[PDB]
Amino acid sequence: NCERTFIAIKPDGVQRGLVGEIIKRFEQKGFRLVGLKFMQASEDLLKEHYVDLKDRPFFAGLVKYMHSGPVVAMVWEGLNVVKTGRVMLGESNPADSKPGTIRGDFCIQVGRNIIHGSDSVESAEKEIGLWFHPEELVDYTSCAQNWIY
Template identity: 50%
Template structure:
């Protein structure tokens, strides 16, 4: 069986408020990605600032923190072959106006500041591990075998 990887994904407050969590989760599961961790939570300011630390010096930082702490989020860790790249493609362009139809942001996103979902960056090798560690303790991640694994990967 091929090596898999884990990736961090979060349905943002606008996605939660609009009742899109199950639709988004269905897309990932239908693709063959496996949930190894999930939690419904509300970010406090400290966690939000740590999550967006790379943007701390940018003018939009405060707005990001205010938005992500404005309501509950659904954080998850998905596992699968090339999971980070798959999730990024499924999410679509950051700006929903530029996202292709069929992507999560293309189908559900309305505004750059309300783009429904966050996923770790596949071009930043440390992003996944950092974000997973920020949101999940090791004992909150579950290793398990999906019965259809042999049908998904060579």
């Protein structure tokens, strides 16, 4: 119930005016927003984040594209939030994401996926600790918690 996930809206999602539509989807699903911040991602930070896929031919291109514009990084809290976030985001390859998701609604290519989300409950914490300072994680109580859980 205190489980948290890390979602990052990419510069493709920022110059396409997609920040509000995704936040509304998460809020109306019912997850509690814990952290929200708007940076220009540094290359060292991106390499630390994507060391998992570093040994890929497209890693350099991914880093260069991601350090082109600003990113919207958010932390969402709730029950099964990590898995529900991937379900809502859809599959990365656009030839596989169904309509009704986020990628399946706003994505055409795989080299730009507009949105990124944590895969596991360990990667989620690793990304939150890497991106957000512990003091920038608001812990409040929503007025709809009794009507969610």
